[PDB]
């Protein structure tokens, strides 16, 4: 039950994906020691609504109270922007943006290293991004999603890191989360052969320590059980006749938007 997007639908997803990437490009100069995550979220929401003329997909979703998710250090995902939570030197911070424009969603996230980097935070982020890139290079018609999950997990584990099991990438379109599930690890339950026109995300969450996670009493914030650092990067893509096209590419990405496997 995976929708195949029309050329028209794909163009709408290009528009929405560009907007989502542009929020991440816009916010970058504000991501500095001393800024609050609450302030970052307000800046993002104002940009999305007032400049992009779009809406945040997260706001109100299952009751989520903010417009973006901002996850620092051992927070794995779903970190809630807060006026009292200040960024500081050495922090690694995920900002995850999902916008709806003209009925279609764009979904992307990246890590920011705040101020003076720690070497371990830098390495975790780099390996996490590399694991996303490796997976993007695999996407083409006929490949199984299982092969991609397996490859992400092998790469990450060889570095002494772990992949979070509880969360996955997803189909995306008129809905935020559509079929298929995109596991970032090997499972016998995964059997999805890719076809041109499918649109989905890849979004591995990678912990420096052990894979186990925990939800806080606020009902939202997820942390590593061992309090190790965690990192995530996310792109939305469309499968093409010969590979894929990344819909949420930024200028700071170092992988081509259009990946072709033809001669």
Ligand X SMILES: N=C1N=NC(N)=C1/N=N/c1ccc(F)cc1
Q: How far apart are CA 6 and CA 119, in angstroms?
A: 44
Q: Which residues sit at the interface with ligand X, rule CB under 6 A?
A: 58, 61-62, 64, 69, 78, 96, 98, 107, 170, 203
Nearer to Na ion (CB atom), residue 113 or residue 150: 113
Q: Which residues contact residue 154 at a Cβ distance below 8 angstroms, ignoring those fewer than 6 apart? A: none
Choose among ligand X, Co ion, Na ion, none what residue 230 binds, the Cβ cut-off being 5 to 8 Å by kind: Na ion
68 — alpha (psi -120 to 50), left (phi > 0) or beta? Answer: beta
Q: Which residues contact residue 69 at a Cβ distance below 8 angstroms, ignoring those fewer than 6 apart? A: 58, 77, 78, 79, 80, 94, 95, 96, 109
Residue of minimal CB distance from ligand X?
62
Choose among Co ion, ligand X, Na ion, none what residue 52 binds, the Cβ cut-off being 5 to 8 Å by kind: none
Select from 9, 22, 41, 96 the one that contacts Co ion (CB under 5 A).
96
Nearer to ligand X (CB atom), residue 7 or residue 63: 63
Q: Check residue 178 for interaction with Co ion (CB under 5 A).
A: no
User: Is position 177 annotated in a ligand binding site?
Assistant: yes
Task: Name the residue among 263, 252, 247, 255 with its Cα closest to residue 13.
Answer: 247
Q: How far apart are CA 165 and CA 151, in angstroms?
A: 15
Q: Which residues sit at the interface with Na ion, rule CB under 5 A?
A: 71, 75, 230
- Binding-site annotation: residue ranges for substrate: 78, 98, 177
Binding region for Co ion (CB under 5 A): 96, 107, 109, 201, 203, 234
């Amino acid at each position: 039950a995976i929708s195949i997007k029309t050329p028209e639908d794909i163009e709408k997803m290009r528009v929405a994906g560009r907007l989502a990437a542009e929020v991440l490009e816009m916010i970058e100069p504000y991501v500095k020691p001393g800024v609050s995550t609450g302030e970052l979220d307000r800046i993002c929401n104002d940009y999305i609504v007032n400049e992009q003329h779009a809406v945040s997909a997260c706001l109100g979703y299952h009751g989520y109270p903010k417009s973006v998710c901002i996850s620092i250090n051992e927070v794995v995902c779903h970190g809630i922007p807060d006026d009292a939570k200040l960024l500081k030197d050495g922090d690694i911070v995920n900002i995850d943006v999902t916008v709806i424009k003209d009925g279609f969603h764009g979904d992307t996230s990246k890590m920011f290293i705040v101020g003076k980097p720690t070497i371990m935070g830098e390495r975790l982020c780099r390996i996490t991004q590399e694991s996303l890139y490796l997976a993007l290079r695999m996407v083409k018609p006929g490949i199984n999603l299982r092969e991609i999950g397996a490859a992400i997990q092998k790469f990450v584990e060889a570095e002494g890191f772990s992949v979070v099991r509880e969360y996955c990438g997803h189909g995306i379109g008129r809905g935020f989360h559509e079929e298929p599930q995109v596991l970032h690890y090997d499972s016998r339950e995964t059997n999805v052969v890719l076809k041109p026109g499918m649109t989905f995300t890849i979004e591995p969450m990678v912990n420096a320590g052990k894979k186990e996670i925990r939800t806080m009493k606020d009902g939202w914030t997820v942390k590593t059980k061992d309090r190790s650092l965690s990192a995530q990067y996310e792109h939305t893509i469309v499968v093409t006749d010969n590979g894929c096209e990344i819909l949420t590419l930024r200028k700071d990405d170092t992988i081509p938007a259009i990946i072709s496997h033809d001669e």
